[PDB]
Amino acid sequence: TDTFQMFWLDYCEVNNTLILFGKVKLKDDNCVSAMVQINGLCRELFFLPREGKTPTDIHEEIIPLLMDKYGLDNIRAKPQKMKYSFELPDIPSESDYLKVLLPY
C-alpha cells in the first residue's frame, strides 16, 4: 500500500545505470507503461589471497589504490569462504575471499 509495484518485462544499460521497463496498474484498474532507473548497483569482486596471506592483507593493499583509481571516499569490503569448482586450475576448492563491492 506504500510501495511502487511494477511488472518488469525488459531492460537497458545506460550511463552505468540499469533501467527496467514494465507495466503499472492505475486507479481505474488499467495498466500503463513505466520505467525504473536503478542506481547504486555494484560489482562483486572476489580477491583470492596468496599462499599464507589473508583477506585482511588484500584489504590493506588494494582498497586504498581502488579509492585512488575511482575516486571513491569509502569502499565496502568483507571476507567470506567462497567455493570454486571450475576450469581454472590454480584456484582451490574453497578459500576465504575479500568481497569488494565497487559501484558501477
Side-chain angles (χ1 to χ4, degrees), residues 1-34 36 38-104:
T1 185
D2 58 337
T3 54
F4 178 72
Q5 306 182 288
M6 100 164 188
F7 193 33
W8 80 282
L9 299 168
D10 207 16
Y11 75 98
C12 168
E13 320 183 350
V14 47
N15 297 111
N16 312 293
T17 67
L18 178 61
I19 296 167
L20 298 184
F21 312 124
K23 317 224 75 178
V24 173
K25 188 184 293 151
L26 296 187
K27 65 181 183 180
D28 63 341
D29 274 18
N30 293 337
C31 291
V32 302
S33 63
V36 178
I38 309 178
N39 301 283
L41 272 159
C42 301
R43 286 106 52 82
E44 310 135 344
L45 282 76
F46 294 88
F47 300 80
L48 180 55
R50 192 87 65 168
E51 161 66 0
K53 286 58 151 173
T54 41
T56 306
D57 295 28
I58 304 171
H59 193 27
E60 293 177 350
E61 295 302 320
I62 200 156
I63 312 281
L65 295 174
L66 298 164
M67 309 175 204
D68 169 22
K69 200 219 287 189
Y70 330 99
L72 255 184
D73 286 23
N74 77 315
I75 287 145
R76 274 231 70 190
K78 52 181 300 180
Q80 54 285 125
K81 198 168 182 53
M82 278 294 128
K83 293 172 286 188
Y84 194 80
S85 183
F86 291 104
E87 312 319 303
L88 290 182
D90 214 307
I91 290 98
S93 285
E94 195 175 24
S95 307
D96 289 333
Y97 290 80
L98 179 70
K99 186 177 74 154
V100 177
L101 319 96
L102 301 130
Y104 280 89

